[PDB]
Design an enzyme around this catalytic site. Structure first.
Site, PDB file in Angstrom:
ATOM      1  N   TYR A   5       6.648   6.635  -9.346  1.00 46.19           N
ATOM      2  CA  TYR A   5       5.441   7.187  -9.914  1.00 46.19           C
ATOM      3  C   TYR A   5       5.359   8.641  -9.997  1.00 46.19           C
ATOM      4  O   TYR A   5       5.721   9.267  -9.138  1.00 46.19           O
ATOM      5  CB  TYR A   5       4.234   6.798  -8.932  1.00 46.19           C
ATOM      6  CG  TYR A   5       4.145   5.235  -8.617  1.00 46.19           C
ATOM      7  CD1 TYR A   5       3.594   4.392  -9.246  1.00 46.19           C
ATOM      8  CD2 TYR A   5       4.634   4.820  -7.518  1.00 46.19           C
ATOM      9  CE1 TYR A   5       3.462   2.886  -9.342  1.00 46.19           C
ATOM     10  CE2 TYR A   5       4.519   3.515  -7.125  1.00 46.19           C
ATOM     11  CZ  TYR A   5       3.979   2.568  -7.794  1.00 46.19           C
ATOM     12  OH  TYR A   5       3.977   1.296  -7.552  1.00 46.19           O
TER      13      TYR A   5
ATOM     14  N   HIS B 229       0.248  -5.667 -14.503  1.00 49.45           N
ATOM     15  CA  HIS B 229       1.600  -5.805 -15.066  1.00 49.45           C
ATOM     16  C   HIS B 229       2.148  -7.069 -15.141  1.00 49.45           C
ATOM     17  O   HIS B 229       2.427  -7.574 -14.125  1.00 49.45           O
ATOM     18  CB  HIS B 229       2.563  -4.738 -14.165  1.00 49.45           C
ATOM     19  CG  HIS B 229       3.830  -4.320 -15.043  1.00 49.45           C
ATOM     20  ND1 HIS B 229       4.909  -3.721 -14.185  1.00 49.45           N
ATOM     21  CD2 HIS B 229       4.376  -4.691 -16.088  1.00 49.45           C
ATOM     22  CE1 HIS B 229       5.766  -3.678 -14.786  1.00 49.45           C
ATOM     23  NE2 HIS B 229       5.265  -4.228 -16.037  1.00 49.45           N
TER      24      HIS B 229
ATOM     25  N   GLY C 151       3.430  11.021  -0.543  1.00 50.09           N
ATOM     26  CA  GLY C 151       3.920  12.470  -0.204  1.00 50.09           C
ATOM     27  C   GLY C 151       5.280  12.624   0.416  1.00 50.09           C
ATOM     28  O   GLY C 151       6.039  13.362  -0.023  1.00 50.09           O
TER      29      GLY C 151
ATOM     30  N   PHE D 260       0.827  -1.305  -0.052  1.00 46.03           N
ATOM     31  CA  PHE D 260       0.152  -0.116  -0.051  1.00 46.03           C
ATOM     32  C   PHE D 260       0.874   1.166  -0.088  1.00 46.03           C
ATOM     33  O   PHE D 260       1.047   2.063   1.055  1.00 46.03           O
ATOM     34  CB  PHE D 260      -1.049  -0.021   1.380  1.00 46.03           C
ATOM     35  CG  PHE D 260      -2.107  -1.132   1.233  1.00 46.03           C
ATOM     36  CD1 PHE D 260      -1.629  -2.284   1.613  1.00 46.03           C
ATOM     37  CD2 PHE D 260      -3.384  -0.941   0.746  1.00 46.03           C
ATOM     38  CE1 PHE D 260      -2.613  -3.423   1.584  1.00 46.03           C
ATOM     39  CE2 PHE D 260      -4.240  -2.004   0.573  1.00 46.03           C
ATOM     40  CZ  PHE D 260      -4.143  -3.158   1.003  1.00 46.03           C
ATOM     41  N   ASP D 261       1.294   1.655  -1.243  1.00 46.62           N
ATOM     42  CA  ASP D 261       2.212   2.888  -1.196  1.00 46.62           C
ATOM     43  C   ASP D 261       1.696   3.888  -0.690  1.00 46.62           C
ATOM     44  O   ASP D 261       2.472   4.965  -0.044  1.00 46.62           O
ATOM     45  CB  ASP D 261       2.624   2.966  -2.786  1.00 46.62           C
ATOM     46  CG  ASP D 261       3.342   2.183  -3.467  1.00 46.62           C
ATOM     47  OD1 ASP D 261       3.052   1.799  -4.671  1.00 46.62           O
ATOM     48  OD2 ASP D 261       4.242   1.190  -2.616  1.00 46.62           O
ATOM     49  N   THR D 262       0.458   4.231  -0.842  1.00 50.21           N
ATOM     50  CA  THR D 262      -0.049   5.522  -0.059  1.00 50.21           C
ATOM     51  C   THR D 262      -0.561   5.375   1.375  1.00 50.21           C
ATOM     52  O   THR D 262       0.177   5.762   2.252  1.00 50.21           O
ATOM     53  CB  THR D 262      -1.363   5.775  -0.691  1.00 50.21           C
ATOM     54  OG1 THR D 262      -1.127   6.081  -2.159  1.00 50.21           O
ATOM     55  CG2 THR D 262      -1.993   6.956  -0.046  1.00 50.21           C
ATOM     56  N   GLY D 263      -1.072   4.174   1.960  1.00 52.22           N
ATOM     57  CA  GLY D 263      -1.619   3.897   3.034  1.00 52.22           C
ATOM     58  C   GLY D 263      -0.466   3.516   4.008  1.00 52.22           C
ATOM     59  O   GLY D 263      -0.523   3.671   5.133  1.00 52.22           O
ATOM     60  N   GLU D 264       0.328   2.675   3.463  1.00 52.56           N
ATOM     61  CA  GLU D 264       1.365   2.118   4.365  1.00 52.56           C
ATOM     62  C   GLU D 264       2.557   3.087   4.496  1.00 52.56           C
ATOM     63  O   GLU D 264       3.138   3.151   5.370  1.00 52.56           O
ATOM     64  CB  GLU D 264       1.563   0.599   3.959  1.00 52.56           C
ATOM     65  CG  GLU D 264       0.354  -0.293   4.588  1.00 52.56           C
ATOM     66  CD  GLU D 264       0.729  -1.794   3.823  1.00 52.56           C
ATOM     67  OE1 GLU D 264       1.452  -1.883   2.650  1.00 52.56           O
ATOM     68  OE2 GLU D 264       0.462  -2.655   4.313  1.00 52.56           O
TER      69      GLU D 264
ATOM     70  N   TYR E 194      10.018   1.302  -6.805  1.00 57.67           N
ATOM     71  CA  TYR E 194       8.948   1.823  -7.624  1.00 57.67           C
ATOM     72  C   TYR E 194       9.203   3.481  -7.582  1.00 57.67           C
ATOM     73  O   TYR E 194       9.437   3.984  -6.739  1.00 57.67           O
ATOM     74  CB  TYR E 194       7.568   1.964  -7.271  1.00 57.67           C
TER      75      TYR E 194
END
Ligand SMILES: [Cu+2]
Ligand SMILES: [Cu+2]
EC number: 1.4.3.21
Lengths: 621, 621
Positions: free
Chosen positions: B376, B584, B297, B289-293, B374
């Protein structure tokens, strides 16, 4: 000289000469289509034979002919009289644009229709619209156009604002007769104007747009040689131009180290049809084959630097034939340039400390055409990473009608009383594939979901399945966006360094296909539009998904008949036909001139290269 | 001062101060997340209350807390101790990146695993990977990371080239213990390097790329006021930045004549998860979970002019908190500029003689982040015609494994011995809608095919149907690309001049959603990914589709629980959550660094305006 070079003016004149000498181009003859033919397979070595193919209309009522000549040798290779009732009428002639209005202006039924509506015949523009094939037995074998009226309140008025609904007329272009005038009822002629240069409707123009300057101070990174041969960032190709298809791309290949590897032998939009979805008998016949009936190349715009094409532009000014066999140059009808395209690849690695960023570019080859109310930009993009893309840009003015007082299930409202019938814009891309050469195959690739259990205890696994399309009888496919369906063109005899077949993967947009009832005329005449992807065995006479003569042809022609040959396409010279379209429910924002909307597809290398092919891109200056 | 202004350094310091004075930020405390809260509905008038929300980890083993403070008033609004076994662990701390490697380096089971493979522990990098929730009861309530090994042959080597398969370890970050070391078998460590700056592998760099100069000689057409307020070509908005979500867009509106009309109240990527599809027990737990974990930012790149951001760029350098409550500036972490975007509208009219061409532009607001392997780019575009778009650009280095000798149904081959497991990158866009204001609704719109017959005699008609989503229990929708399905957000109390409700239409890409078995852990923890579109009633605490504390949370949290409230969403303050992702299957061309691939969505005005909103665009200079 490259046998894929553009037709030159002298080549057209030589066709004219050969036909004249042969007795095939007397004064009653009109050239409806003329175009160079592609070199035959294997002719690379050796010796030119530039052949041209011509469709010749006869304004006296004699039968038209299809003629192939050799400009090289000054000979007529073939000439056949056509029975248009069987094989179709010729394409619409530019000279027939005004005929529909001119004949109707003195027809008493038309004048009566207009008098009841208090419209001045002198202000009534009539769109020359292709007729199709419906119930009217008198039309079979005859060259018909249909007409719908639009009032022009003054010479610089936009007639599209003032459709005259409830009224349609059919005319025999050759005999110069009005065959039917149907008046089903009076509708108000919408009153507002749609003049998008009128300060009353635009309001004061914006002053807020500051300039954007795009320049290449050392000029572009691509070279043009031999008139139409492009070399750019390892790509190699030739830019053709045909009056029917428009820009064509030949011999797309990629220099991979020291080898020139082919990818696509020929790329074109082989058909483009606009079916309408309004069941009113005033318009329920309209299906405009922009490519096959009208010839989009013919109406290519001259594209103005700074406004139509921004940056460092290199133009081609392709030649076509006018109706008498004289060459005509379309000045600046093809724009070519390269652009920046954002980040290509980027990674900031904590462990190694290296931060890496590279920028992408694409080569752009485009033209813009105008067919009555429609305007389309056809764009081919080549990217540094090997991705090939096509995009259409649909704009212009929407085709209008009245808006019924009780509303409509098949028409949007744009302005008081003004409707715009629902329609689609459906394209066919003909991709004559040459992945690493001609021995190719196609696989349909779907995502596979796996059930949690033995060998997949946590229920996370997923996979893919590839299905070879072995013969043409298996090669009519539909989209499945839910399963991420794509189609891979591979060369089963050419393997990358990892021992896997080289390929390219076609990524479609999975828009709706032809909505019309399967029993309808348009479903039969435009069968290709009913399925997303067709694969055929290459054959030099299988050029368009709709056949050679689309206009007023009864149906069946084209891909459904090619496919029935059930030819072997598993490691063979094959052709991929991709249907893709826009379904257009017009919106208020489309009126009085519509913002561009887009559709297209792309192909990405899929194990074609041994590793990324853009590692040699340098850090930007 | 706009209550939507960016957090300033002084604001962070004041949070630190308030927590310190309140006894909540002693030396054993680490801030895991800190961010300004949005102003409450209706607070516009009047009086600031800038509130900040903080998640506080305690490195001594005491319970963590969630704390909201008022920097305006210097007070603690709320402070609650969290039972992480129930509501989840805090987000991963940057300081925990190296801990996983450091603990394993002196663990005898890890050293044994490495000795059998003849790997020098000093050259073995360990990725700190989120643990999820599986069968390991000892992990419940404990802050765990999992580790996978990658050999770095030297300090500037790309470790991703040298995965160590058959080996995974779990560690308790707080107690500083290795809880499990699983060695299922030896795999060769792939031998090739993946150093994309090494001239041996790039080959001689290209010299063929001529320069492209993009400049704005009078500067840009957009103004920045109040730190983060953008005015551009009738758009108005504020650019926020949150350490979890990254760039957020507030108060997107469009000046239509003399009225400022809202469109979207808040736009963010509220979650982004990377599920892996390899059933091997070495990786079958990985879902990042790139955002939540991890908080995207937090790892935003500093974007370099000319290389990361080309043209006339205006930057924002947003502030975040470090782990102790000190402000930290991300220099040039947000790029803003306008670009040319081709033809906007074009028509060449035969009848009126007028030829018309106008060019489009878009405003671009972007950042780029790096989470381990990663990278993005998150891009928000605003177009002249009112279209709003989001695009993600996925690049970086693919996560690798061994390639089994018998091949794999779940892993691609990149280089000899080198695999890359299948995975998806799935996003959630949270669009707090405000179409002409807050009273909104959503309709699902499908194309309707009609059967040939009475009232449709020629079988050409087609239509559309719109279905209102009345309550949250009806608002969990899936794509149907075949029927051209879209979702329209309208204001049923605001009508355009044609008496039809103003709206915007969401155009999705209709890519596959979450493939995992519905019974899997990830399907429960990332339920949002299983459906394309959710609509909820606005509520200030319903921020993320996965809940507040994603890390090691058992599942269920988030949208499936919000929706169960079955609230009225038919003409109410509503929120649209759009799932969209990339599936992917890695390709050779992805190795050793991958070209950008993209995914996203767009919204187009649909009867929002009375006619085209770009008629006042002037002919280009
Ligand atoms: Cu259209
Ligand atoms: Cu990926």
């Amino acid at each position: 000289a490259s046998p894929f070079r553009l037709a030159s003016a002298g080549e057209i004149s030589e066709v004219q000469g050969i036909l004249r000498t042969a007795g095939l181009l007397g004064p009653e003859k009109r050239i409806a289509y003329l175009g160079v033919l592609d070199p035959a397979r294997g002719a690379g070595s050796e010796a030119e034979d530039r052949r041209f193919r011509v469709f010749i209309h006869d304004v006296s009522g004699a039968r038209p002919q299809e003629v192939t000549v050799s400009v090289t040798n000054g000979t007529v290779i073939s000439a056949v009289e056509l029975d248009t009732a069987a094989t179709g009428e010729l394409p619409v002639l530019e000279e027939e644009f005004e005929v529909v209005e001119q004949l109707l202006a003195t027809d008493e039924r038309w004048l009566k229709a207009l008098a009841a509506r208090n419209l001045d015949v002198s202000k009534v523009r009539v769109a020359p619209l292709s007729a199709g094939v419906f119930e009217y037995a008198e039309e079979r074998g005859r060259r018909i156009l249909r007409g719908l009226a639009f009032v022009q309140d003054f010479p610089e008025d936009s007639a599209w604002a003032h459709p005259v609904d409830g009224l349609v007329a059919y005319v025999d272009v050759v005999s110069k007769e009005v065959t039917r005038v149907i008046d089903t009822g009076v509708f108000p002629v919408p009153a507002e104007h749609g003049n998008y240069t009128d300060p009353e409707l635009t309001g004061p123009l914006r002053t807020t747009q500051k300039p954007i300057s795009i320049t290449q101070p050392e000029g572009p990174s691509f070279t043009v040689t031999g008139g139409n041969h492009i070399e750019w960032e390892k790509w190699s190709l030739d830019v053709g131009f045909d009056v029917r298809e428009g820009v064509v791309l030949h011999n797309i290949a990629f220099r991979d180290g020291d080898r020139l590897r082919p990818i696509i032998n020929r790329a074109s939009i082989a058909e483009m049809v606009v079916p309408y979805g309004d069941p009113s008998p005033i318009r329920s016949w309209q299906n405009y084959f922009d490519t096959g009936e009208y010839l989009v190349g013919q109406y290519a715009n001259s594209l103005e630097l700074g406004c139509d094409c921004l940056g460092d532009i290199t133009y081609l000014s392709p030649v076509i034939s006018d109706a008498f066999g004289n060459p005509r140059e379309i000045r600046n009808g093809i724009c070519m340039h390269e652009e920046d395209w954002g980040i290509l690849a980027k990674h900031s690695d904590l462990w190694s400390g290296i931060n890496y960023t590279r920028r992408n570019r694409r080569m752009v080859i485009s033209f813009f055409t105008t067919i009555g109310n429609y305007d389309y930009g056809f764009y081919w993009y080549l990217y540094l990473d090997g991705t090939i893309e096509f995009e259409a840009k649909a704009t212009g003015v929407v085709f209008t009608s009245a808006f019924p007082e009780g509303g409509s299930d098949n028409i949007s409202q744009l302005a008081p009383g003004l409707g715009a019938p629902f329609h689609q814009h459906i394209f066919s891309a003909r991709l004559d594939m040459a992945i690493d050469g001609f021995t190719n195959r196609v696989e349909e690739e779907d995502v596979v979901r796996q059930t949690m259990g033995p060998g997949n205890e946590r229920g996370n696994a997923f996979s893919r399945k590839r299905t070879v399309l072995t013969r043409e009888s298996e090669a009519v496919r539909e989209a499945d966006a839910r399963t991420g369906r794509t189609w891979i063109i591979s060369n089963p005899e050419s393997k990358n360094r990892l021992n896997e077949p080289v390929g390219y993967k076609l990524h479609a947009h999975n828009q709706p296909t032809l909505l019309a009832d399967p029993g309808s005329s348009i479903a039969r005449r435009a069968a290709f539009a009913t399925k997303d992807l067709w694969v055929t065995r290459y054959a030099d006479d299988e050029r368009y998904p709709t056949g050679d003569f689309v206009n007023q042809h009864s149906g069946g022609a084209g891909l459904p008949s090619y496919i029935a040959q059930d030819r072997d396409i598993d490691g063979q010279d094959i052709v991929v036909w991709h249907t893709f379209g826009l379904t257009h429910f017009p919106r208020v924002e489309d009126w009085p001139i519509m913002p561009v909307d887009t559709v297209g597809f792309k192909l990405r290398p899929e194990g074609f290269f041994d590793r990324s092919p853009v590692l040699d891109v340098p850090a930007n200056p």
